[PDB]
Structures are given as C-alpha cells and as structure tokens.
Amino acid sequence: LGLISGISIIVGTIIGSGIFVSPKSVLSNTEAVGPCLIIWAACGVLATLGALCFAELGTMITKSGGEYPYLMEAYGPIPAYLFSWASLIVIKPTSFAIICLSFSEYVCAPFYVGCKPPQIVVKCLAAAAILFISTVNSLSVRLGSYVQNIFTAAKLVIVAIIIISGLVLLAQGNTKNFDNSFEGAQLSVGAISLAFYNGLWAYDGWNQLNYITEELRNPYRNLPLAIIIGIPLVTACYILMNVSYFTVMTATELLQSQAVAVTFGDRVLYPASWIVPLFVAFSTIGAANGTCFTAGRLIYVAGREGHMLKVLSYISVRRLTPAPAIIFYGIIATIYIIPGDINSLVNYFSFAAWLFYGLTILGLIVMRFTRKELERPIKVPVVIPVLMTLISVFLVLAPIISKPTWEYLYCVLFILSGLLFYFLFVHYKFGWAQKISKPITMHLQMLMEVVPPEEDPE
Amino acid sequence: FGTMEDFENLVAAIHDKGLKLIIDFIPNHTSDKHIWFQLSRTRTGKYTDYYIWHDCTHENGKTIPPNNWLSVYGNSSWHFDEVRNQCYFHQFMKEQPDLNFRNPDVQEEIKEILRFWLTKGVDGFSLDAVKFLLEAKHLRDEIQVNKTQIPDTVTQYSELYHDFTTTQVGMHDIVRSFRQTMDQYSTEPGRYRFMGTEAY
Ligand SMILES: CCCCCCCCCCCCCCCCCC(=O)OC[C@H](COP(=O)(O)O)OC(=O)CCCCCCCCCCCCCCCCC
Ligand SMILES: CCCCCCCCCCCCCCCCCC(=O)OC[C@H](COP(=O)(O)O)OC(=O)CCCCCCCCCCCCCCCCC
Ligand SMILES: *[C@@H]1O[C@H](CO)[C@@H](O[C@@H]2O[C@H](CO)[C@@H](O)[C@H](O)[C@H]2NC(C)=O)[C@H](O)[C@H]1NC(C)=O
Ligand SMILES: *[C@@H]1O[C@H](CO)[C@@H](O[C@@H]2O[C@H](CO)[C@@H](O)[C@H](O)[C@H]2NC(C)=O)[C@H](O)[C@H]1NC(C)=O
Ligand SMILES: [Ca+2]
C-alpha cells in the first residue's frame, strides 16, 4: 500500500450509512440551511483532529485492542475496565442496532409513498436483519469478505450519483432554497450539541484507522498525511451531498420525509427511482456485516487481564468463527430496537462514545507529563489534543444540562453498573466468583462446541 | 391583488406551514380584450377559429341571430361584431366570448395554461362552468317551456330547455383530458394535483 491506496481505505471506511439518515436530524436541531452546512464541516474537523491524536497513541504504545491499551497506560485499570464494559453492552450493540434500523427505513419507504410506515414494520424488519447477519457471520467466516468489496462499490456509486446530479441542477439555477440561509436559527447549547451527535455519527470509524493503515510503504509520514487528505476529502463529499438535497427539497420538505435519499431519487431519477432504495439497502447490510468481523478482538485482549469473561472470544471447532461473541451482540442489539427509534439510539451511542474519546485524548496529555521517554515517532502539536478534549466535555455536559432525556440516565446507570462489577470480581476477588464463572464456561462450551483459540497474544 | 412576485411569495409561505393551495380556472371563455379575440376578429392566422363565428343580418341597429339561443343573464347569446362583420357566441355576457373547443389549437392553448400554474407550484384547480363547454353544431332552436308563447317575447333564460347548449357529447372527454394533463405533475408522492369541477 502506497499513499494513494492509503487514502482509499480511509475514504471507504468513513463513508457509511450515516449520510443517508443524519441530514434530517441536523436540520431538525438547527432549523436553517446555512447553519446546517457549518455543522457538517465542523464535524469533519473533529474527525480529523481526533484521528491525528489516535495516530500518536497508536505508534507510541503498539499493542492490540482498541482504546483499551491506551487507557491502561495513562490512568490504570479502572478506566480501561470501564471501556471494555461500555463497549460490550452499550457501544457495540447500539452501533449494530442503528445500522439495521437504517436498513429497514430504506426498504419500507418506497412501499409507503406518501405516508409513514407503521412502527411495527420498520422494527420487525430490522430484527430480521439482525438475526440474519448474526447467523451468516456465525457460520461462514470467509463469506462475509467475498461480498464486502461489492458492498463498498455499491456505496460509492450511489454517493457519486447524488453529488454529480446535484452539481448539474445547481448550474441550471435551482438555488432558491439557499437565499435566506441564516434566518431562524438556534444558538442554544442543546440544539447545537445534538446536531453534533448526528453529524459525527456519519463519520463513525475514525478511531479505528490505526490498525489497518499502518502496513504502508513509509509510516510515520504517510499515516498523518493520509488523515489530513482523506478525512477532509470525505468532508467535501458530505457537504456536496447536502447541497444536492437542498436543490430539489425545501428545508420543510426534508423534515417531512421518511428516508431523505429516496425523496431525492423520486424528484431527479424519475424512470429509475428504485435504484436509491436498492443501493442504500445493499450498502447498509454491508456496514453491518463489517462490524461482525471485529467481534472478539477487544474481548480477547480484555479477558487476558481478567477484565472480561473468557467464555466469550472462544472459537467454534467447526466453522472457525467467534460464535459466542456474535450471538451476544445480536441479542443485545435486538433488545435495543424494541424501544428503538434512531434519534434516540444515536444520542445513547454518542454519549458513551464521546465520554471515552474524551478520556483517551486527555490521556495523550497526561502521558506528556507522566510517561515521557517513550519514543513518540508521530507527535502532534499540543493545541490539537487540548481542543479535542474541550469539545469532548462540551459534547458530554451540554445535552445533560440543557435537554435531559431518559437515555442519559440509562447510559450512566449502565456504565456505573460496571463499576460495581469491578469491585466484586476484579479488585476484591472473593470465593463465590470463580465457582459461578467456571460452570457457566463449562456448560456453554459443550452447548456451542467452542474452544479456546489455540493462540498467542498475536 | 399584487404582482407575480407577490403570488410566488405566497406559494412558498403556504408550503412552509404545511398547507396546500388550489385556485380557480376559467376554461370556457375569455374577455373581448384578450389578445386572441383581437386577432380572431381581424382573421389573423390560426386565431380565426378560436371563437365561434356565424353570419347574421345586422342592419339599422338590430341583429337577426342564427337561432333562438339565450345567454344565462338573459337576451340573445349572439352578438354582432363590426370589424369581422359576423356574429359571435357567448354563454354569459357580450364581453365574454366563448372559446371554440372543437378546435384542437384551442385545447392545446388551455393545456399550456394548466402547465404554467402547476410549474409555479399550485396544488390543484377548481374548474368553473364545465357544462357550458360544448354546444351543438347543428345550431337548431331550443324547445320553449311554453310552446304557445310568441318567439319574440322569449328573452329570459328560464323560458327554454337547454338541450343543445349544456352537457353535449364530448364534454366529459375534455375534462378527462385536463386530468391527464395534470397527471404528469402528480407522479411525485405527496404532490398529487387535485381537480374539482363546479356544476350548479
Ligand atoms: C427479555 C430480555 C432477555 C432476553 C434473553 C433471550 C435469550 C434467548 C436466547 C436465544 C439464543 C439463540 C441462539 C441461536 C442463534 C444461532 C446463531 C448461529 O448461527 O449459531 C451457529 C452455531 C454453529 O453450530 P453448528 O450448527 O453445529 O455449526 O450454532 C450454535 O452455536 C447453536 C447454539 C445455540 C447457542 C445458545 C446460546 C444461549 C446462551 C444463553 C446463556 C444463558 C446463561 C445464563 C446464566 C446466568 C447465571 C447467573
Ligand atoms: C452466547 C451468548 C451467551 C454467552 C456469553 C454470556 C454469558 C452468559 C452468562 C452471563 C453472565 C452470568 C453472570 C456472571 C458470571 C461471571 C461472574 C464473574 O465472577 O466474573 C469473573 C470474570 C472472570 O472470569 P473468567 O473468565 O473465568 O476468568 O471477571 C470479569 O470478567 C469481570 C467483568 C464482568 C463482565 C460481566 C459481563 C456480563 C454480561 C451480561 C450483561 C448483562 C446486561 C445485558 C444488557 C442489559 C439489557 C440491555
Ligand atoms: C336585454 O336586456 C336588457 C336588460 O338589461 C333590456 O334593456 C333595458 O332593461 C330595462 C330594465 O332593466 C328596461 O327598463 C329598458 O326599457 C330596457 N331597454 C329597452 C331598449 O327596452 C333590453 O330590452 C333587452 N333586449 C335587448 C334586445 O337588448
Ligand atoms: C304560457 O302558457 C299559457 C298556458 O299554458 C298560455 O295561455 C294563457 O293561460 C292563462 C292561464 O290561466 C290564461 O289566463 C291566459 O288567458 C292564456 N292566454 C294568454 C296569456 O294569451 C300563455 O299564452 C303562454 N304565454 C305567456 C307569455 O304567458
Ligand atoms: Ca362554450
């Protein structure tokens, strides 16, 4: 991989299902077109400054996991344990639930042309996509990656159709909706901070660019150069897709819409309007098939320290798959869609994710005073992790001060539920702990035929 | 009522509150100051058959009409034009000459007016006086309600049976072709175009 194929993996990773669901909720909180395009550009700066700080932490430590070896080196075991606990029950199953809910919005929308589908149909189709992907990835480990490259080709084509056909309409003079773009707006701290939750969901994947883009021809120079080129170029493709939405829709017509890109393909591509519900539905289960490849990597490295159960990250003897972890993620993601509702799972996801993005980037500054003499090949200027940890407390405190809903209580109580399990199973190892953990591991071993992975740390 | 910019600001403001807008449409007749009628009575081009013209015997201040047909507001429905030296038909008033809907150039001009307002963003139309669209081309006299009445005193509209001037064969097909013109602007979901007719 050179430099050009280094920035191509960055563009393919960061373009996901977010740009097809998020424009409604950014406009719902900043009610004008003008502020709606500033938040889409300011989210691409938070993704670029955030990925640069993770690029320094990735070369300084050089250990597998996620943010788990980064938090242990800075604070110790207690924030490292809470990240392994919150990524098990909060972060990873909600990400699997938002994607499978976004798949069922785009299948059910062309059948209910001028009205909404009922909530029983979008939820019973989303649960059928969770249980289909959780069994396909639990049987046929290599089948998920043969279809993975035609699911990325279907994603970039339908993005390039919307961008190009929007610049053609912009040249003909369909620019009336941009005329008064700053009249009627919100400088409330809860309207802007939730508009940042939905824009930054469309950039999901900037914190895992380290592990796959460090097998390059010349690292420590081409990795921070692929981030400065790659993530601002997807920021240009996200602004140009919102510009294309506002050539055929008013800001009121976009709020009164079920899926935003079906409404685009119904006013532009008229005799072939079904290609937009077809290509987005392919690209969305490909984004859910891709998150089941990663099942078991953090669970293995957290269980090696005693911070996670060891019956998870076991491997099936036939069909060599991480079957106890894939089944565990499919069960919690199915529970999450019964209360359901994208715009209520994105707030639940972004509150726990940005609490631990903020603790990790703060650990970059703590390790500049505590963990010197540690050979940093990449070294960002100090003003970049300071701004990224000041926005990270603005994105945590401002929804729970100004617009408090019930998900910010159910997310805090699920993270502090793990702090009880630290002090009974890790810090104060008692007697009754391992005689619950060992018969459960023994009986789930004969049920699923799963063994320890004949392996080493790597 | 304002300008065209005042209308375009009203359509945008109506849509921003979730409302819809339907307007009236008058297909049956124009004014005598319309540019089609000023070219019709000089026999200019294709406009010669845009209105219904027939010969008559107007001399010393009185016209002899081609039949006994009456206007709705009540006198003869034929009025003599001095430039054309013929008589034209009108269902309502002498300042409202009727369009000739047996001419396919007239029906194409009406479809361009429908496409003009649907492009501006109007959500529908109410069609007025659709039963007065076609008349019988045999031009025979109506039947009087009172058959012993002398025909020089029959001047009120309620004194004739209007079998040849309302609801003729082919009138419902003209209304159905208007519905097909608006169907090209209704293929988008949520932007169906309404059509209502007023026949009282
Ligand atoms: C209401 C809120 C709570 C809801 C809880 C609902 C629980 C329902 C469990 C449903 C499990 C469904 C499993 C079947 C999915 C098959 C997916 C697949 O492809 O498998 C391939 C895999 C391949 O096998 P092959 O066909 O032999 O190749 O097949 C299986 O592994 C089937 C084994 C079923 C696994 C069941 C796991 C259930 C674990 C429950 C443990 C509970 C312990 C609690 C103890 C607490 C003590 C304090
Ligand atoms: C196939 C899917 C099922 C298989 C995987 C799940 C296992 C099923 C049983 C679940 C746990 C049963 C009780 C705990 C038993 C072990 C306790 C212990 O002493 O740990 C020692 C354990 C080490 O045991 P070792 O693996 O034997 O070394 O220490 C820890 O791992 C500390 C971390 C505890 C992690 C707890 C994980 C809880 C999973 C269930 C979460 C429930 C909430 C779901 C979401 C709410 C609704 C949305
Ligand atoms: C046509 O109808 C008009 C009514 O608008 C008649 O004109 C005059 O009507 C008033 C009543 O409002 C009478 O007092 C006048 O005597 C009418 N004028 C004349 C000259 O008689 C008119 O008579 C009707 N007929 C014609 C042929 O014009
Ligand atoms: C209208 O019809 C009537 C009968 O259908 C005609 O005859 C008149 O009828 C009334 C009824 O009582 C008599 O009082 C009159 O003597 C009749 N003769 C007349 C008015 O000459 C009548 O002629 C018809 N025409 C009009 C204009 O009324
Ligand atoms: Ca007529």
Coordinates of C-alpha atoms in Angstrom, one line a residue, chain A residues 113 252 266-267 270, chain B residues 15-16 187-189:
Chain A
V113 CA -45.1 6.5 -0.8
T252 CA -39.6 21.8 5.3
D266 CA -38.0 10.5 -6.7
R267 CA -37.5 14.0 -8.0
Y270 CA -37.7 9.5 -12.4
Chain B
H15 CA -45.9 25.4 1.7
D16 CA -43.7 26.2 4.7
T187 CA -46.2 11.2 -10.3
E188 CA -44.2 12.5 -7.3
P189 CA -45.5 11.1 -4.0

